[PDB]
Amino acid sequence: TMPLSCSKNNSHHYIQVRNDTGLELTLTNTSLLDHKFCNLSDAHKRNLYDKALMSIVTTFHLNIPNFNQYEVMSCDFNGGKITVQYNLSHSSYVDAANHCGTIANGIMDTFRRMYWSNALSPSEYISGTTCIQTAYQYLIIQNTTWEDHCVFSRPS
Ligand SMILES: *[C@@H]1O[C@H](CO)[C@@H](O[C@@H]2O[C@H](CO)[C@@H](O)[C@H](O)[C@H]2NC(C)=O)[C@H](O)[C@H]1NC(C)=O
Ligand SMILES: *[C@@H]1O[C@H](CO)[C@@H](O)[C@H](O)[C@H]1NC(C)=O
Ligand SMILES: *[C@@H]1O[C@H](CO)[C@@H](O)[C@H](O)[C@H]1NC(C)=O
């Protein structure tokens, strides 16, 4: 049994990239990845990670600033299906500002502005970008299907 993505305590949205498969982005306080690794030494896994993230950037038309910043992250695969977990650092205004030039923040600002969440707030405005503040501890991405997007798929 795995926890739900479509829950009252979470925010979620599903990107359909092709007829069958897509990405489910989930803001939650439950984590699915125990470790803190992102073993991408194989070229094929490193490219599936690039492609999941590219499909989010193009659909949301994200323009991520370069601030020499970095969001804590673990990743993992289950038979070619990626699971990416960001351990967010945006609980304060200072933390939101220091983790602003990241894919996580651009995603969250899309949730805030499409009203898919109420727990996202503005912090600092810089370079035409909004730094997002939130109490959510994780942002989860999984390569999944439309029929399963409401339940977290097994990561490994
Ligand atoms: C979701 O996962 C699949 C599997 O990793 C991704 O792509 C295809 O996977 C098959 C193996 O089942 C490979 O033989 C193909 O070469 C892969 N195609 C591509 C274009 O990479 C699929 O792209 C993933 N979807 C998302 C949205 O990340
Ligand atoms: C997530 O966890 C933080 C505590 O770290 C809490 O303040 C926040 O309200 C929680 N949000 C949800 C939706 O449970
Ligand atoms: C990356 O994953 C492979 C798969 O087993 C593993 O052998 C390798 O040691 C990992 N990378 C590092 C630096 O350990």
Author numbering: 80 to 235
Text lifted from the article:
LASV has a surface-displayed class-I trimeric glycoprotein spike complex that mediates receptor recognition and fusion of the viral and host-cell membranes at acidic pH. The spike complex consists of three copies of a single polypeptide chain that is cleaved twice to give a structured signal peptide, a receptor-binding module (GP1), and a trans-membrane module (GP2). We previously showed that a triad of histidines on GP1 is important for binding LAMP1, and we further demonstrated that the binding of LAMP1 triggers the spike of LASV to catalyze membrane fusion by potentiating its response to pH. We present a crystal structure of the GP1 domain from the Morogoro (MORV) OW mammarenavirus, which does not interact with LAMP1, and conduct a comparative structural analysis between GP1 of MORV and LASV (GP1MORV and GP1LASV, respectively) to identify structural differences related to the ability to bind LAMP1.
Similarly to GP1LCMV-Fc, GP1MORV-Fc did not pull down LAMP1 from HEK293T cells, nor did it interact with recombinant LAMP1 immobilized on a sensor chip. GP1MORV has a central β–sheet made of five β-strands, flanked by the domain termini on one side and helices and loops on the other. The global structure of GP1MORV is similar to the previously determined structure of GP1LASV. The histidine triad in GP1MORV (His91, His92, and His228 according to GPCMORV numbering) adopts the same conformation as the triad in GP1LASV. GPCMORV has a β-hairpin made of two β-strands (β5 & β6) stabilized by a disulfide bridge (D3) against α3.
